[PDB]
Design a binder for this molecule. Structure first.
Ligand SMILES: CC(F)(F)c1nnc(N[C@H](c2cn3ncc([C@@H](C4CC4)N4C[C@@H](C(F)(F)F)NC4=O)cc3n2)C2CCC(F)(F)CC2)o1
Lengths: 98, 99
């Protein structure tokens, strides 16, 4: 264990609507985790929006997955003690050539 | 102060075909945890078309997200931190510019 003290008191999105692989945000909630709420990107379409403004299936919208560190309550249900943990979160969508 | 204890011992390529591909840039700060953060930098100003050529009628833009980091408090402290928000680039997407 490398135990440290953390003080939790801390001292654009509408532009991504113009993406050829647009996404919406999905609420992910876990009361055993900090941050408990994580907004996860879900691609709106299987294809990408082409020059005509239409969904084109010759290209694919794919979620960008990132490794994210979160705090897991340790022991479970502990309000003040945690262990660092890695999870995968979707942070947006990009358009790929299959 | 909302002081909590954190155990820092972690429990636990595809996007190359993107029309708005990106590379990773090393962001290092010895006063922060994680000290090293890899940020996405868009490879091109435009988006890659069907022919494999850059088209400047569209733009590759970095997706900026707010993430939480630990700042050493007091400075240089090996075991005490304050939570802090920073803005990082987590990938690139292709956008149709405003006309
Ligand atoms: C909104 C949220 F997703 F819940 C969220 N916000 N911050 C976190 N987690 C915070 C957080 C910060 N980072 N910074 C870097 C990384 C690494 C991944 C290889 C491990 N990445 C991911 C990628 C990107 F950051 F650019 F995305 N590039 C990287 O180098 C993960 C990460 N996790 C977390 C909150 C608890 C804490 F303070 F104790 C510690 C830090 O989650």
């Amino acid at each position: 264990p490398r135990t440290v003290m953390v003080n939790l008191n801390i001292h654009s999105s509408d532009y991504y609507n113009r993406s050829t692989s647009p996404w919406n945000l999905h609420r992910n909630e876990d009361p055993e985790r900090y941050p408990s709420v994580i907004w996860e990107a879900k691609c709106r379409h299987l294809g990408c929006i082409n020059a005509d403004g239409n969904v084109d299936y010759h290209m694919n919208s794919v979620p960008i997955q990132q490794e994210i560190l979160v705090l897991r309550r340790e022991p479970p249900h502990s309000p003040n003690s945690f262990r660092l943990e890695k999870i995968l979160v979707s942070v947006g969508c990009t358009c790929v050539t299959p």
